[PDB]
């Protein structure tokens, strides 16, 4: 007989089922798989989509049910470079402006993330009661330099995550008096400047702008973060 043999055989049956379950749970976004033209792929693999689950979202924001119909919900300015599958797709315009490649953004909801109390999670520090810089070089006041070593603007605030008490963006004022948000993760605060490797100074103007000066929506965050990260590949030319 043997209880240890029963246990090891049983465990391997269990683990196979567990892996099957875990894989299907991980197909709740992005599937069914598509051809390059957006139509459903003929081979979906041996794992089926899981039965749907529904997340109840806080503050009257509704629900998310996944899996569900996938749609990009935005135009994608790319075209095939080959006559068969598997090759890159070339930007049909300016990929920074069009938001493709590493400049890509997702059509998230055009509302701000809220905290557990239903208040905007990210606020400019100037509007965040009691918030202040508590350690490190305070970036407010510093000129902002791009990868061309030219000054694009000056830091006029920090946008802070209120519940998690963290710096999320720098607000940078440009020569025309408008501002843009830069992700904190993409700037280097130095003693005499903030340096931004991803963008040359002349690309700061094109950072997507926010529709209201004291809040930022998840859609806007995705457009800002995407554009800034896309500069690593695309700031290149010059001239």
């Amino acid at each position: 007989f043997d209880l240890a043999s029963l246990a090891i055989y049983s465990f391997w049956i269990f683990l196979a089922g567990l892996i099957y379950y875990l894989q299907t749970e991980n197909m709740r976004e992005g599937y069914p798989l598509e051809n390059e033209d957006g139509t459903p792929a003929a081979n979906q693999g041996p794992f089926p989509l899981p039965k749907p689950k529904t997340f109840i979202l806080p503050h009257g924001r509704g629900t998310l049910t996944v899996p569900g119909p996938e749609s990009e919900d935005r135009p994608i300015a790319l075209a095939r470079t080959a006559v068969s599958e598997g090759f890159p797709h070339a930007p049909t315009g300016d990929p920074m402006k069009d938001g493709v490649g590493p400049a890509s953004w997702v059509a998230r909801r055009d509302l701000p993330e809220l905290d557990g109390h239903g208040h905007n999670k990210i606020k400019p520090m100037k509007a965040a009661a009691g918030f202040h810089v508590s350690a490190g070089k305070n970036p407010i006041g510093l000129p902002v330099r791009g990868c061309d070593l030219e000054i694009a603007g000056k830091v006029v605030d920090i946008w802070v995550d209120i519940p998690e008490q963290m710096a999320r963006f720098l607000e940078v004022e440009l020569k025309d008096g408008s501002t843009r948000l830069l992700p904190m993760q993409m700037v280097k605060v130095q003693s005499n400047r903030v340096h931004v490797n991803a963008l040359s100074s002349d690309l700061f103007a094109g950072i997507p702008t926010i529709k209201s000066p004291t809040e930022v929506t998840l859609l806007e965050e995705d457009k800002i973060c995407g554009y800034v990260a896309g500069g690593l590949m695309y700031a290149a030319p010059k001239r």
Partner: protein, 302 residues
Amino acid sequence: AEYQNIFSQVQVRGPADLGMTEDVNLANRSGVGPFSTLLGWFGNAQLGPIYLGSLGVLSLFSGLMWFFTIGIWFWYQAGWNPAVFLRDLFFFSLEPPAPEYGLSFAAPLKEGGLWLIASFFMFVAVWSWWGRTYLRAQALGMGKHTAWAFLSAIWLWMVLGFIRPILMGSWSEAVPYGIFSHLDWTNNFSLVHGNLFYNPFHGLSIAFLYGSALLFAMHGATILAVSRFGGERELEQIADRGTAAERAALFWRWTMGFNATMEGIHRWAIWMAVLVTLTGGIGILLSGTVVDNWYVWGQNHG
């Protein structure tokens, strides 16, 4: 150079965050502790508040009694000499009853009794703390995943000190409380059962342990890599997938041909972790009870 978001460049602080209320009895929350700027370079600066109700007090009291029972035994072994206490600290050990005592509670204090008292206090501390992990989640309306995950760790602990010794018929089989002595116990356990490398549940426990380091290295790296797109705001990425979650998925899709989602990586995570101690407790529990010698067993099975 390029910033990597391993330590923060600038810290911000606001009023102390007293937390969400939900159904929590606020009367049992402490005030906040001090803020630590040192910690704040890597994680949150804020210390406290802590919740401590009757169960938490019982758990801390009992845990302290466990630690102090072992500790006074150490002092005793030190001949009450502070110099000797520091010198031989890792050599002291509170040991269980000899095998001749079986599972009785009749061993003298100095020959197992104190081990039983200490173990009793540990039993109460850990299970009351388990109760806390459940009730703290319940009071906030959260699922009970933590209490379930903690139960996998509790399974190995219980097998080691309680279930296996009871099934073997003596407390002498349990783990002593000492730094070196518990490592000596572990080595001996393996030698006596024919080399645990031949126990398939041990090899699995190792696959999950190593796999937990593989996976948290993958996952931590991944989230940091997409932190420039808000990647660590995982709950909202679950609710409203963003370019962080898509770039993360596609890194792995392009690398190894498949990927996770922002929620599902956490299910891979919780299982990779818990399976360490679930498979481990099974492997230990069968040892000596069902299988005297894993080498021998492996010659007739697999």
